[PDB]
Coordinates of C-alpha atoms and ligand atoms in Angstrom, one line a residue:
Chain A
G1 CA 0.0 0.0 0.0
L2 CA 0.8 3.7 -0.3
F3 CA 1.8 4.1 3.4
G4 CA 4.2 1.1 3.6
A5 CA 3.0 -0.3 6.9
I6 CA 0.8 -3.3 6.2
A7 CA 2.9 -5.7 4.2
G8 CA 5.6 -3.1 4.6
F9 CA 7.7 -2.1 7.7
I10 CA 5.3 -4.3 9.7
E11 CA 6.5 -7.8 8.6
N12 CA 3.2 -9.5 9.0
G13 CA -0.3 -9.7 10.6
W14 CA -1.3 -11.3 13.9
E15 CA -3.7 -14.3 13.5
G16 CA -4.0 -14.3 17.3
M17 CA -5.7 -10.9 17.3
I18 CA -9.4 -11.7 17.0
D19 CA -11.0 -8.8 19.0
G20 CA -9.7 -6.0 16.7
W21 CA -8.1 -5.1 13.4
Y22 CA -5.2 -3.1 14.8
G23 CA -3.5 -3.2 18.2
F24 CA -0.7 -3.6 20.6
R25 CA 1.8 -6.3 21.8
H26 CA 4.1 -5.6 24.7
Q27 CA 7.0 -7.1 26.7
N28 CA 7.8 -5.6 30.1
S29 CA 9.0 -6.6 33.6
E30 CA 5.6 -8.4 34.2
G31 CA 5.6 -10.5 31.0
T32 CA 3.9 -10.3 27.6
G33 CA 0.3 -9.4 26.4
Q34 CA -1.9 -8.3 23.6
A35 CA -4.8 -5.8 23.2
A36 CA -6.9 -4.4 20.3
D37 CA -7.0 -0.7 19.6
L38 CA -10.7 0.1 19.2
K39 CA -10.6 3.6 17.7
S40 CA -8.4 2.7 14.7
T41 CA -10.3 -0.6 14.2
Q42 CA -13.6 1.3 14.1
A43 CA -12.3 4.0 11.7
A44 CA -11.4 1.3 9.2
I45 CA -14.7 -0.6 9.6
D46 CA -16.8 2.6 9.4
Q47 CA -15.1 3.6 6.2
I48 CA -15.5 0.1 4.7
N49 CA -19.2 0.0 5.8
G50 CA -19.6 3.4 4.2
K51 CA -18.3 2.2 0.8
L52 CA -20.2 -1.1 1.1
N53 CA -23.5 0.7 1.6
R54 CA -22.8 3.0 -1.3
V55 CA -22.1 0.1 -3.7
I56 CA -25.1 -2.1 -2.7
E57 CA -27.4 1.0 -2.9
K58 CA -30.3 -0.2 -5.1
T59 CA -30.0 2.0 -8.2
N60 CA -32.5 0.6 -10.7
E61 CA -36.0 -0.7 -11.3
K62 CA -37.1 -1.5 -14.8
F63 CA -40.4 -2.8 -16.1
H64 CA -41.3 -3.1 -19.8
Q65 CA -38.1 -3.0 -21.9
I66 CA -37.1 -4.6 -25.3
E67 CA -37.1 -8.2 -26.2
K68 CA -33.6 -9.8 -25.9
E69 CA -34.2 -13.4 -27.3
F70 CA -35.8 -14.1 -30.7
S71 CA -37.3 -17.3 -32.1
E72 CA -37.1 -16.1 -35.8
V73 CA -34.5 -14.5 -38.1
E74 CA -35.6 -10.9 -39.0
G75 CA -32.6 -8.9 -40.0
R76 CA -32.2 -5.1 -39.5
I77 CA -34.5 -4.4 -36.5
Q78 CA -33.4 -7.5 -34.6
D79 CA -29.7 -6.7 -35.4
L80 CA -30.3 -3.3 -33.7
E81 CA -32.1 -4.7 -30.7
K82 CA -29.3 -7.2 -30.0
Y83 CA -26.6 -4.6 -30.6
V84 CA -28.3 -2.1 -28.2
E85 CA -28.4 -4.8 -25.5
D86 CA -24.9 -6.1 -26.1
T87 CA -23.5 -2.5 -26.0
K88 CA -25.3 -1.9 -22.7
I89 CA -24.1 -5.1 -21.1
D90 CA -20.4 -4.4 -22.1
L91 CA -20.6 -0.9 -20.7
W92 CA -22.1 -2.2 -17.4
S93 CA -19.6 -5.0 -17.3
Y94 CA -16.8 -2.5 -17.7
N95 CA -18.3 -0.2 -14.9
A96 CA -18.4 -3.2 -12.6
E97 CA -14.8 -4.3 -13.3
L98 CA -13.5 -0.7 -12.8
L99 CA -15.6 -0.1 -9.7
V100 CA -14.2 -3.2 -7.8
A101 CA -10.6 -2.4 -9.0
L102 CA -10.7 1.2 -7.7
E103 CA -12.7 0.3 -4.5
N104 CA -10.2 -2.5 -3.6
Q105 CA -7.0 -0.5 -4.3
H106 CA -8.5 2.2 -2.1
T107 CA -9.6 -0.2 0.7
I108 CA -6.1 -1.6 0.9
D109 CA -4.6 1.9 1.0
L110 CA -7.0 3.1 3.6
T111 CA -6.4 0.1 5.9
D112 CA -2.7 0.6 5.4
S113 CA -3.2 4.3 6.3
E114 CA -5.1 3.6 9.5
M115 CA -2.2 1.3 10.7
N116 CA 0.2 4.2 9.9
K117 CA -2.0 6.7 11.8
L118 CA -2.0 4.6 14.9
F119 CA 1.8 4.1 14.7
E120 CA 2.4 7.9 14.3
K121 CA 0.0 8.7 17.1
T122 CA 1.8 6.3 19.5
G123 CA 5.2 7.7 18.5
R124 CA 3.9 11.2 19.4
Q125 CA 2.5 10.1 22.7
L126 CA 5.9 8.7 23.8
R127 CA 7.8 11.9 22.9
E128 CA 11.5 11.4 23.9
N129 CA 10.8 8.4 26.2
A130 CA 11.1 5.8 23.3
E131 CA 12.6 5.0 19.9
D132 CA 11.3 3.5 16.6
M133 CA 13.0 0.2 16.0
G134 CA 11.8 0.4 12.3
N135 CA 9.6 -2.8 12.4
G136 CA 6.5 -1.2 14.0
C137 CA 8.0 -1.7 17.5
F138 CA 9.0 1.0 20.0
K139 CA 11.8 0.4 22.5
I140 CA 10.6 2.2 25.7
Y141 CA 13.6 3.3 27.8
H142 CA 12.0 3.1 31.3
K143 CA 10.0 0.9 33.7
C144 CA 6.6 0.4 32.1
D145 CA 4.5 -1.8 34.3
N146 CA 1.0 -3.0 33.1
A147 CA -0.6 0.3 34.4
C148 CA 1.9 2.2 32.3
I149 CA 1.2 0.1 29.1
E150 CA -2.6 0.4 29.6
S151 CA -2.0 4.2 30.0
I152 CA -0.3 4.3 26.5
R153 CA -3.1 2.2 25.0
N154 CA -5.9 4.3 26.6
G155 CA -4.4 7.7 25.9
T156 CA -3.5 8.8 29.6
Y157 CA 0.3 8.3 29.5
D158 CA 2.0 11.4 30.7
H159 CA 5.5 11.5 29.2
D160 CA 6.9 14.1 31.6
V161 CA 6.6 11.6 34.4
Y162 CA 9.2 9.2 32.9
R163 CA 11.2 11.7 30.8
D164 CA 14.2 12.1 33.2
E165 CA 14.5 8.3 33.7
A166 CA 14.2 7.6 29.9
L167 CA 16.5 10.4 28.7
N168 CA 19.2 9.0 31.0
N169 CA 18.8 5.4 29.6
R170 CA 18.8 6.6 26.0
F171 CA 21.9 8.9 26.0
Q172 CA 24.7 6.6 27.3
Chain B
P3 CA 15.3 -2.4 32.3
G4 CA 12.8 -1.1 29.8
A5 CA 9.9 -2.4 27.6
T6 CA 9.0 -3.1 24.0
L7 CA 5.7 -1.9 22.5
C8 CA 4.8 -3.4 19.1
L9 CA 2.0 -1.9 16.8
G10 CA 0.4 -4.4 14.5
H11 CA -2.7 -5.6 12.6
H12 CA -4.7 -8.8 12.3
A13 CA -4.4 -11.6 9.8
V14 CA -6.5 -14.7 9.1
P15 CA -5.3 -18.2 8.0
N16 CA -7.4 -18.4 4.9
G17 CA -7.9 -15.0 3.1
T18 CA -9.6 -14.2 -0.3
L19 CA -8.3 -13.0 -3.6
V20 CA -9.5 -9.7 -5.0
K21 CA -8.6 -7.5 -8.0
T22 CA -7.2 -4.0 -7.8
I23 CA -5.7 -1.4 -10.2
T24 CA -2.3 -2.9 -9.9
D25 CA -3.0 -6.6 -9.2
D26 CA -5.0 -9.3 -10.9
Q27 CA -5.1 -11.3 -7.6
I28 CA -4.1 -10.0 -4.2
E29 CA -5.1 -11.5 -0.8
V30 CA -7.2 -9.6 1.7
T31 CA -8.7 -10.7 5.0
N32 CA -12.3 -10.7 3.7
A33 CA -14.5 -9.8 0.7
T34 CA -18.1 -9.8 -0.4
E35 CA -19.7 -11.0 -3.7
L36 CA -21.2 -8.3 -5.9
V37 CA -22.6 -10.6 -8.7
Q38 CA -25.8 -12.5 -8.1
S39 CA -25.2 -15.8 -10.0
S40 CA -28.0 -18.0 -8.7
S41 CA -31.8 -18.2 -8.7
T42 CA -34.3 -20.4 -6.7
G43 CA -35.7 -21.5 -10.1
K44 CA -39.1 -20.2 -9.0
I45 CA -41.0 -16.9 -9.7
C46 CA -42.3 -15.4 -6.5
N47 CA -45.9 -14.5 -6.6
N48 CA -45.4 -11.3 -4.5
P49 CA -45.0 -8.3 -4.6
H50 CA -45.8 -8.1 -8.4
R51 CA -49.1 -9.5 -9.7
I52 CA -48.0 -12.5 -11.8
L53 CA -50.4 -13.9 -14.3
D54 CA -49.5 -17.4 -15.6
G55 CA -50.5 -17.8 -19.2
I56 CA -50.4 -21.6 -18.8
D57 CA -51.5 -22.8 -22.3
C58 CA -52.1 -19.4 -23.6
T59 CA -50.1 -16.6 -25.3
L60 CA -51.2 -13.1 -24.4
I61 CA -52.4 -12.7 -27.9
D62 CA -54.7 -15.8 -27.7
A63 CA -56.1 -14.5 -24.4
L64 CA -56.7 -11.1 -26.1
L65 CA -58.5 -12.6 -29.1
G66 CA -60.4 -15.0 -26.9
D67 CA -59.3 -18.4 -28.1
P68 CA -61.9 -20.7 -26.2
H69 CA -59.2 -22.5 -24.1
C70 CA -58.0 -19.0 -23.0
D71 CA -61.5 -17.8 -21.9
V72 CA -60.4 -17.9 -18.3
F73 CA -58.2 -14.8 -19.0
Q74 CA -61.1 -12.6 -19.9
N75 CA -60.7 -9.1 -18.2
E76 CA -57.5 -10.3 -16.4
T77 CA -54.9 -7.9 -15.2
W78 CA -51.2 -8.2 -14.5
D79 CA -47.9 -6.6 -13.6
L80 CA -46.1 -9.5 -15.4
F81 CA -47.8 -11.8 -17.8
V82 CA -45.8 -15.1 -18.1
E83 CA -45.9 -17.0 -21.4
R84 CA -45.0 -20.7 -21.3
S85 CA -43.2 -22.6 -24.0
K86 CA -46.1 -25.2 -23.9
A87 CA -48.7 -22.5 -25.1
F88 CA -50.7 -23.4 -28.1
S89 CA -53.4 -21.8 -30.3
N90 CA -56.6 -23.8 -30.8
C91 CA -59.0 -21.6 -32.7
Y92 CA -59.2 -20.3 -36.3
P93 CA -55.7 -20.1 -37.9
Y94 CA -54.5 -16.5 -37.9
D95 CA -51.6 -14.1 -38.2
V96 CA -50.8 -10.7 -36.8
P97 CA -48.8 -8.4 -39.1
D98 CA -46.6 -6.8 -36.5
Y99 CA -47.4 -9.4 -33.9
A100 CA -44.5 -8.2 -31.7
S101 CA -46.0 -4.7 -31.5
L102 CA -49.5 -5.8 -30.6
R103 CA -48.1 -8.1 -27.9
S104 CA -45.9 -5.3 -26.6
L105 CA -48.6 -2.7 -26.4
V106 CA -51.1 -5.1 -24.7
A107 CA -48.4 -6.4 -22.3
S108 CA -47.5 -2.9 -21.3
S109 CA -51.1 -1.9 -20.8
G110 CA -51.5 -4.6 -18.2
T111 CA -55.2 -5.4 -18.7
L112 CA -57.6 -7.3 -21.0
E113 CA -60.6 -5.4 -19.7
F114 CA -63.1 -5.5 -22.5
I115 CA -66.2 -3.3 -23.0
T116 CA -68.8 -4.6 -25.4
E117 CA -70.3 -1.9 -27.7
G118 CA -73.6 -2.1 -29.7
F119 CA -72.3 -2.3 -33.3
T120 CA -75.2 -2.5 -35.8
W121 CA -74.3 -4.8 -38.7
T122 CA -77.3 -4.4 -41.0
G123 CA -78.0 -7.2 -43.5
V124 CA -75.4 -9.7 -42.5
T125 CA -75.3 -12.9 -40.4
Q126 CA -73.4 -12.5 -37.1
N127 CA -71.6 -14.9 -34.8
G128 CA -70.0 -17.1 -37.5
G129 CA -68.0 -20.0 -36.1
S130 CA -65.8 -22.9 -37.2
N131 CA -64.9 -26.5 -36.1
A132 CA -61.3 -25.2 -36.0
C133 CA -62.4 -23.2 -32.9
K134 CA -64.7 -25.4 -30.7
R135 CA -66.7 -23.8 -27.9
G136 CA -68.2 -26.6 -25.9
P137 CA -69.3 -29.4 -28.3
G138 CA -70.2 -27.0 -31.2
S139 CA -68.4 -24.7 -33.6
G140 CA -67.2 -21.4 -32.3
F141 CA -64.9 -18.5 -32.6
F142 CA -62.7 -15.9 -30.9
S143 CA -64.9 -14.4 -28.1
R144 CA -63.9 -10.8 -28.9
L145 CA -64.4 -11.0 -32.7
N146 CA -67.7 -11.3 -34.7
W147 CA -67.5 -13.2 -37.9
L148 CA -69.9 -11.6 -40.4
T149 CA -71.2 -13.5 -43.4
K150 CA -74.1 -13.0 -45.8
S151 CA -77.8 -12.9 -44.8
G152 CA -80.0 -14.6 -47.4
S153 CA -78.2 -14.0 -50.7
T154 CA -76.6 -10.6 -50.1
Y155 CA -73.8 -8.9 -48.2
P156 CA -74.3 -5.2 -48.4
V157 CA -71.8 -2.4 -47.8
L158 CA -71.3 -2.2 -44.0
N159 CA -70.7 1.3 -42.8
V160 CA -70.7 1.9 -39.0
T161 CA -69.3 4.4 -36.5
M162 CA -68.5 4.3 -32.8
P163 CA -67.4 7.6 -31.3
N164 CA -65.1 7.7 -28.3
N165 CA -66.9 10.0 -25.8
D166 CA -64.9 8.6 -22.8
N167 CA -61.8 10.2 -21.4
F168 CA -59.6 7.2 -22.0
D169 CA -58.1 5.5 -25.1
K170 CA -59.9 2.6 -26.7
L171 CA -58.1 -0.4 -28.3
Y172 CA -60.1 -2.1 -31.1
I173 CA -59.0 -5.5 -32.3
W174 CA -60.4 -6.6 -35.7
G175 CA -59.5 -8.7 -38.7
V176 CA -59.9 -9.8 -42.2
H177 CA -60.7 -13.2 -43.5
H178 CA -58.6 -14.7 -46.3
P179 CA -60.5 -17.5 -48.1
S180 CA -58.7 -20.4 -49.9
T181 CA -61.0 -20.4 -53.0
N182 CA -63.2 -18.1 -55.0
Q183 CA -66.1 -20.5 -54.2
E184 CA -65.5 -19.9 -50.5
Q185 CA -65.3 -16.1 -51.0
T186 CA -68.6 -15.9 -52.9
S187 CA -70.4 -18.4 -50.8
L188 CA -69.6 -16.4 -47.6
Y189 CA -69.5 -12.8 -48.8
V190 CA -71.3 -12.7 -52.2
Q191 CA -68.9 -10.1 -53.7
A192 CA -65.9 -11.8 -55.6
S193 CA -63.5 -9.4 -53.8
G194 CA -63.9 -8.0 -50.3
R195 CA -62.5 -5.0 -48.6
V196 CA -62.0 -3.7 -45.0
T197 CA -61.4 0.0 -44.3
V198 CA -61.1 1.0 -40.6
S199 CA -60.4 4.6 -39.9
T200 CA -60.3 7.5 -37.4
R201 CA -60.0 11.3 -38.1
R202 CA -56.2 10.8 -37.9
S203 CA -55.4 7.4 -39.6
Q204 CA -56.8 4.8 -41.9
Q205 CA -56.0 1.1 -42.7
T206 CA -57.4 -0.6 -45.8
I207 CA -56.9 -4.3 -46.2
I208 CA -57.8 -6.3 -49.4
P209 CA -58.3 -10.0 -48.7
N210 CA -56.1 -12.4 -50.7
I211 CA -57.7 -15.6 -51.9
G212 CA -55.5 -18.8 -52.0
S213 CA -54.5 -21.9 -50.1
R214 CA -52.2 -21.6 -47.1
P215 CA -51.0 -24.8 -45.3
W216 CA -53.7 -26.7 -43.5
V217 CA -53.9 -25.8 -39.8
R218 CA -56.6 -27.0 -37.5
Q219 CA -58.8 -27.9 -40.5
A220 CA -58.5 -24.7 -42.6
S221 CA -56.3 -23.7 -45.5
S222 CA -57.9 -20.2 -44.9
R223 CA -56.6 -17.5 -42.5
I224 CA -57.6 -14.5 -40.5
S225 CA -55.2 -11.5 -40.3
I226 CA -55.5 -9.4 -37.1
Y227 CA -55.2 -5.6 -37.0
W228 CA -55.7 -3.0 -34.3
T229 CA -56.8 0.6 -34.1
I230 CA -56.5 3.0 -31.1
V231 CA -59.2 5.6 -30.7
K232 CA -58.4 8.7 -28.6
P233 CA -61.0 10.7 -26.6
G234 CA -63.0 12.9 -29.0
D235 CA -62.1 10.8 -32.0
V236 CA -64.4 8.3 -33.9
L237 CA -64.0 4.8 -35.3
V238 CA -65.5 4.1 -38.7
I239 CA -65.6 0.6 -40.2
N240 CA -66.5 0.2 -43.9
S241 CA -66.6 -3.2 -45.6
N242 CA -68.2 -5.0 -48.6
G243 CA -66.9 -8.4 -47.4
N244 CA -64.4 -10.4 -45.3
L245 CA -64.7 -8.2 -42.1
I246 CA -64.0 -9.9 -38.9
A247 CA -65.6 -7.3 -36.7
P248 CA -64.8 -6.1 -33.2
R249 CA -67.4 -6.6 -30.5
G250 CA -66.1 -3.6 -28.5
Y251 CA -62.8 -2.3 -27.2
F252 CA -60.1 -3.0 -24.7
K253 CA -59.4 -0.4 -22.1
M254 CA -55.8 0.9 -22.2
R255 CA -53.6 1.8 -19.2
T256 CA -50.1 3.0 -18.7
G257 CA -48.0 1.7 -15.8
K258 CA -45.4 -0.9 -14.8
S259 CA -46.9 -4.0 -16.7
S260 CA -44.8 -6.2 -18.9
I261 CA -44.5 -9.8 -20.3
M262 CA -41.9 -12.5 -20.0
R263 CA -41.2 -15.9 -21.6
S264 CA -40.4 -18.4 -18.8
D265 CA -41.1 -22.0 -17.8
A266 CA -40.2 -21.4 -14.1
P267 CA -43.0 -22.4 -11.7
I268 CA -44.7 -19.7 -9.7
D269 CA -44.3 -20.1 -5.9
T270 CA -45.5 -18.3 -2.7
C271 CA -42.7 -16.0 -1.7
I272 CA -41.6 -12.4 -2.0
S273 CA -39.0 -11.1 -4.5
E274 CA -38.7 -7.7 -6.2
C275 CA -36.6 -9.1 -9.1
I276 CA -37.8 -11.6 -11.6
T277 CA -35.8 -13.3 -14.4
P278 CA -36.9 -16.2 -16.7
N279 CA -34.8 -18.5 -14.6
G280 CA -36.8 -17.4 -11.5
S281 CA -36.7 -14.7 -8.9
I282 CA -33.3 -13.5 -7.7
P283 CA -32.3 -11.5 -4.7
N284 CA -31.5 -7.8 -5.3
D285 CA -29.0 -7.1 -2.4
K286 CA -26.1 -7.2 -4.9
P287 CA -25.6 -4.4 -7.5
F288 CA -24.8 -6.9 -10.4
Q289 CA -26.1 -10.2 -11.7
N290 CA -25.1 -12.8 -14.3
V291 CA -28.3 -14.8 -14.2
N292 CA -30.1 -13.3 -17.2
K293 CA -30.2 -10.1 -19.2
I294 CA -34.0 -10.4 -19.2
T295 CA -35.3 -9.0 -15.9
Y296 CA -38.4 -7.4 -14.4
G297 CA -38.5 -5.3 -11.3
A298 CA -35.9 -3.8 -8.9
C299 CA -32.9 -5.9 -10.2
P300 CA -29.1 -6.0 -10.1
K301 CA -27.7 -4.9 -13.4
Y302 CA -26.7 -7.6 -15.8
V303 CA -22.9 -8.1 -16.4
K304 CA -20.8 -10.8 -18.0
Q305 CA -18.6 -11.6 -15.0
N306 CA -19.8 -14.5 -12.9
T307 CA -18.0 -13.2 -9.8
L308 CA -16.7 -9.8 -8.6
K309 CA -15.2 -9.5 -5.1
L310 CA -15.3 -6.3 -3.1
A311 CA -12.6 -6.3 -0.5
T312 CA -14.1 -5.8 3.0
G313 CA -10.7 -5.9 4.8
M314 CA -7.1 -5.2 4.8
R315 CA -4.2 -6.9 3.0
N316 CA -3.8 -10.4 4.5
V317 CA -0.2 -11.1 5.6
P318 CA -0.2 -14.3 7.6
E319 CA 2.4 -15.5 10.2
Ligands
LIG401 C1 -70.7 6.0 -43.4 O1 -70.7 6.3 -42.0 C2 -70.1 7.6 -41.7 C3 -70.2 7.8 -40.2 O2 -71.5 8.1 -39.8 C4 -70.9 8.7 -42.5 O3 -70.2 9.9 -42.2 C5 -71.2 11.0 -42.1 O4 -71.5 11.5 -43.3 C6 -72.4 12.7 -43.2 C7 -72.9 13.2 -44.6 O5 -72.6 12.3 -45.6 C8 -71.7 13.8 -42.4 O6 -72.5 14.9 -42.2 C9 -71.9 16.2 -42.2 O7 -71.9 16.9 -40.9 C10 -71.5 18.2 -40.9 C11 -71.4 18.7 -39.4 O8 -70.4 17.9 -38.7 C12 -72.4 19.0 -41.8 O9 -72.1 20.4 -41.7 C13 -72.3 18.6 -43.2 O10 -73.3 19.3 -44.0 C14 -72.6 17.1 -43.3 O11 -74.0 16.8 -43.3 C15 -71.2 13.3 -41.1 O12 -70.4 14.2 -40.4 C16 -70.4 12.0 -41.2 N1 -70.2 11.5 -39.9 C17 -68.9 11.2 -39.5 C18 -68.8 10.7 -38.1 O13 -68.0 11.3 -40.2 C19 -70.8 8.4 -44.0 O14 -71.6 9.3 -44.7 C20 -71.3 7.0 -44.3 N2 -71.0 6.7 -45.7 C21 -71.9 6.4 -46.6 C22 -71.3 6.2 -48.0 O15 -73.1 6.4 -46.4
LIG402 C1 -69.2 -18.6 -40.7 C2 -69.1 -19.8 -41.5 O1 -69.4 -19.8 -42.7 N1 -68.7 -20.9 -40.9 C3 -68.5 -22.2 -41.5 C4 -67.1 -22.4 -41.9 C5 -66.5 -21.4 -43.0 O2 -67.3 -21.4 -44.1 C6 -65.1 -21.8 -43.3 O3 -64.3 -22.0 -42.2 C7 -64.4 -20.6 -44.2 O4 -63.0 -20.9 -44.4 O5 -66.9 -23.7 -42.4 C8 -67.2 -24.8 -41.5 O6 -66.8 -26.1 -42.1 C9 -65.6 -26.9 -42.1 C10 -65.8 -27.9 -43.3 O7 -66.7 -27.4 -44.3 C11 -67.1 -28.3 -45.3 O8 -67.9 -27.7 -46.2 C12 -65.9 -29.0 -45.9 O9 -66.4 -30.2 -46.7 C13 -64.8 -29.5 -44.9 O10 -63.6 -29.9 -45.6 C14 -64.5 -28.4 -43.9 O11 -63.9 -27.3 -44.6 C15 -66.2 -24.8 -40.4 O12 -66.5 -25.5 -39.3 O13 -65.0 -24.3 -40.5 C16 -68.6 -24.7 -41.1 C17 -68.9 -23.3 -40.5 O14 -70.3 -23.2 -40.2
LIG403 C1 -30.7 -18.7 -17.0 O1 -31.4 -19.0 -18.2 C2 -30.6 -18.8 -19.3 C3 -31.4 -19.0 -20.5 O2 -31.9 -20.3 -20.6 C4 -29.3 -19.7 -19.2 O3 -28.5 -19.4 -20.4 C5 -28.0 -20.6 -20.9 O4 -26.8 -21.1 -20.2 C6 -26.3 -22.3 -20.7 C7 -25.0 -22.6 -19.9 O5 -25.3 -23.5 -18.8 C8 -26.0 -22.4 -22.2 O6 -25.8 -23.7 -22.6 C9 -27.2 -21.8 -23.0 O7 -26.9 -21.6 -24.3 C10 -27.6 -20.4 -22.4 N1 -28.7 -19.8 -23.2 C11 -28.8 -18.5 -23.4 C12 -30.0 -18.1 -24.2 O8 -28.1 -17.7 -22.9 C13 -28.5 -19.4 -18.0 O9 -27.4 -20.2 -17.8 C14 -29.4 -19.5 -16.7 N2 -28.7 -19.2 -15.5 C15 -28.9 -19.7 -14.3 C16 -28.0 -19.2 -13.2 O10 -29.7 -20.6 -14.2
NAG404 C1 -16.2 -11.5 6.8 O1 -17.3 -11.5 5.8 C2 -18.0 -12.8 5.8 C3 -19.0 -12.7 4.7 O2 -18.4 -12.5 3.4 C4 -18.7 -13.0 7.2 O3 -19.4 -14.3 7.2 C5 -17.7 -12.9 8.3 O4 -18.4 -13.0 9.5 C6 -16.8 -11.6 8.2 N1 -15.8 -11.7 9.2 C7 -15.9 -11.2 10.5 C8 -14.7 -11.3 11.3 O5 -16.9 -10.8 10.9

């Protein structure tokens, strides 16, 4: 995708994450654990629901039309009736092919984008108390117990609290 | 002693392939189908009024072939013609059959109003063993076969004004005998003539005498014509022989009515979209079942599948 996260600097997905589309894995003093990020997950889902509902939006209702199958050879008029229908079908078939191509390219790019948005948001939360390893993982340079992780994940992590500690561990 | 915090995304073990601008096939976590490719094989009887033609074409129901008498004054949203349909009355043709079928199908009714035509000096209600009504000879219910009274067939000249505020459809015809003996025996004059007119139009038909292939006991034929009379206009019928006269008119409507050729059985269910293969759901925007449809239907396309991605790129472990 355009943002280079999904199938990019993040090597692969997590089959184990079943409660969300994007989220967090951590290792600290107290062990390892996993949690879904709801906001990013919902942003992707809402956008996909949006496009799905636009695409399946019932556009047409038709009643008496032209005949499209014929039991006798007639020539000119029937040639025209068939050509009109064949022309229509090819144009609709093209629209359908193009629609899914554009939709799907965009769906991949937007999901890639939401991964990236969450990554950049987290980086910004952590300020000078962590560093980007380049594989979608931050090395946090301080004691971050389960309370501290959950604070990063739920948006309450004050960086000023751990700054002195983390700055020291970084610049050695 | 610090901590590692990894950002990531889900994957699934068995993804689905979709098409994009750049890729013929690329794997995503999930997709949904946009092409309806199946039918139940049955035409749902709601919410459209479905009229099963059974053994009758719309035209035979219109003319009043005796085995189609059950269709008198019927109405429909969709008239369904079956491949088993057959004619069983006097042999006939309709120049521009397709147009008459279309305009009637589209009107959605066979509501017929009898009018008091006065045919002075001819015998009315002619019939044939080609068109049995009960045990005896008969004819199309909506047509009146006129022949000589005594030894004369005078010039018929009649009018019927339209003083209603709707259009009238008149169905009428011309008899084509096989021999000169038949012509003179039925109509006296050696050559007949039928002129049907309004203020705006006129049709004149000369009968042709000659054998046609034998069908249901006759080498003769009837040719069927139609005339629409608008409010304030007047019908005139003029003939010195061979007239197959109207008994009245059909009331015309405009609306959502049509006709479809199908052998699918009718069932009790609800479906907006009908194809000759049967009803189909209309939750998807496209369909590959049949280019012939009626109602709120997905648009016909040539592809049998098109997958809309409903998830991210699938990158498994
Ligand atoms: C066959 O039937 C038609 C229909 O009735 C006959 O048409 C009628 O012919 C008469 C006279 O021949 C027309 O009368 C005219 O009326 C106007 C006023 O509208 C009057 O000013 C004239 O002096 C004239 O008398 C009458 O309008 C006409 N009716 C219609 C509906 O067209 C026709 O005459 C019959 N043909 C034969 C050969 O008998
Ligand atoms: C209105 C009328 O004259 N009805 C006749 C009918 C017509 O004269 C005929 O269909 C015109 O094409 O003919 C009927 O007879 C069929 C029968 O007639 C014999 O004369 C002949 O020997 C047979 O081969 C056969 O044509 C008919 O039923 O069609 C009688 C009807 O009263
Ligand atoms: C719906 O009915 C149409 C018309 O009968 C089917 O079209 C036929 O498809 C078969 C392929 O299985 C061909 O052999 C025929 O030549 C086709 N005929 C026409 C006129 O196109 C169609 O396959 C049916 N579709 C479904 C889903 O039942
Ligand atoms: C993915 O879509 C399918 C239908 O195409 C659906 O059955 C399934 O529940 C969806 N996946 C999830 C995780 O909801």
